[PDB]
């Protein structure tokens, strides 16, 4: 199959993926994952295809890849990665078996680590974190009832975990330090997004708590988080005061202050505190924040002000589309909020459902309009897009 084949199947699947349920679309991870990704993608060869990484609420690790350059990802992976260094170790793996053409054999494993540990290298992590990531791997392995669901599909034999021994060996000591960032992640997908094994247990916070300023803080942010979805939000934001002190531009610590905010009805101190941000113009997260706080604030015409220009900017992010949809109910503007709500369907490959509404907005605003005109194009292409997944 040609490379153009081969994105087309791959956007099938991206869409009936994002109709599922366990898949992550937190504005703040999907950020990091994908800044992370970017980072591996920049420093790897053969490179033909966009990347885009995928979070999965899965307490299982396991990731692989498919058509188009699409990387999933299970969050679990944010449980089992001690430093930065290691979580992008895996993704620079499946990104290889991806550049490569690649369960799978020994060679392609073999080929894969080979690969890998050469792009985190040059994209500035620690090439021992991936024995290391493995051997915690196979150490869990041989003591438990059964092993890691990811080596079902990457094996593991001890032949290759002393191949990478030997390739981060022979490569310059090269001690790195996680960025803040990865902590702050690690803390919200357990500690938001928990689920079975995934927990932000207090034993992870005292080692934090005891660890280097970046882990104390990121501590810190993941009592205030657990507080805040424990209802206790005085506790919370007192718990949060600190960071956002230390770092008043910091997108994780202004997400969470507006979550706090909202939450005690308090939309103008949210809404100031966002517009003073200096990185809103540039900051997605911020943008959608400012936006919810807007609409719980009683002001969806400037959340809507945000979020026709977010759509058009981020037409695969379907936070914006959500978002955009209940400010234009909040109107009553029901075309708007029908075609909103069409791209969100058309987004999850619910294309009949996406074209049902769409018909509905058009059938109810003015007969040649520019509007009317612009509905009826985008039915005509969602109609054509269905004819090319028929196949499938
Ligand atoms: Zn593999």
């Given amino acids: 199959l040609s490379i153009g084949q081969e994105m087309q199947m ?34 790897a060869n053969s490179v033909k295809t966009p990347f885009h990484f995928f979070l999965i609420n899965n307490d299982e690790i396991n990731a692989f890849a498919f058509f188009g350059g699409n ?22 793996h499946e990104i290889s078996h991806v550049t490569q053409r690649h369960s799978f054999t020994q060679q392609n494993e073999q080929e894969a680590d080979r690969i890998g540990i050469q792009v985190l290298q040059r994209s500035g992590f620690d090439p021992q974190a991936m024995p290391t990531f493995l051997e915690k791997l196979l150490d869990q392995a041989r003591y438990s009832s059964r092993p890691p669901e990811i080596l079902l599909t990457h094996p593991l034999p001890e032949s290759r975990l002393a191949d990478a021994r030997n390739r981060a060996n022979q490569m310059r000591p090269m001690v790195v330090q996680s ?20 927990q932000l247990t207090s034993d992870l916070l ?36 600190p960071l956002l002190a230390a770092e008043p531009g910091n997108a994780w610590y202004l ?13 103008n101190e ?45 037409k695969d992010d379907s936070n914006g589309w959500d978002l955009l949809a209940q400010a234009e109910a909040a109107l009553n503007n029901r075309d708007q909020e029908l075609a909103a709500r069409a791209e969100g369907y058309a987004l999850a490959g619910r294309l009949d459902q996406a074209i049902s509404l769409l018909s509905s907005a058009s059938s ?19 109609r054509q897009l269905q004819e090319r997944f028929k196949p499938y």
Wanted: no cysteine.
């Fill in 10 to 43: 791959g956007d099938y699947y991206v869409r009936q993926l994002r109709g599922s349920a366990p898949l992550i679309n937190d504005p703040l991870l999907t950020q990091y994952i994908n800044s992370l990704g970017m980072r591996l993608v920049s420093h």
């Fill in 71 to 92: 990387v999933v990802l299970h969050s679990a992976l944010f449980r089992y990665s001690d430093n930065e260094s290691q979580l992008a170790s895996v993704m620079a």
């Fill in 179 to 198: 960025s803040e960032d990865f902590y702050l992640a690690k803390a919200r997908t357990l500690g938001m997004y928990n689920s079975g094994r995934n």
């Fill in 206 to 241: 005292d080692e934090w708590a005891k660890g280097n300023v970046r882990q104390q803080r990121a501590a810190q942010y993941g009592r205030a988080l657990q507080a805040m979805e424990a209802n206790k939000y005085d506790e919370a934001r007192k718990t949060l005061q």
């Fill in 255 to 267: 997400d969470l202050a507006t979550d706090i905010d909202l939450g005690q009805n308090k939309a």
């Fill in 270 to 314: 949210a809404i100031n505190r966002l517009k003073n941000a200096r990185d809103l113009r540039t900051n997605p997260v911020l943008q959608l924040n400012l936006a919810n706080a807007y609409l719980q604030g009683g002001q969806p015409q400037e959340a809507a002000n945000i979020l026709n220009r977010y759509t058009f900017n981020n």
């Fill in 364 to 382: 109810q605003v003015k007969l040649g309009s520019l509007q009317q005109a612009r509905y009826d194009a985008r039915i005509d292409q969602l």
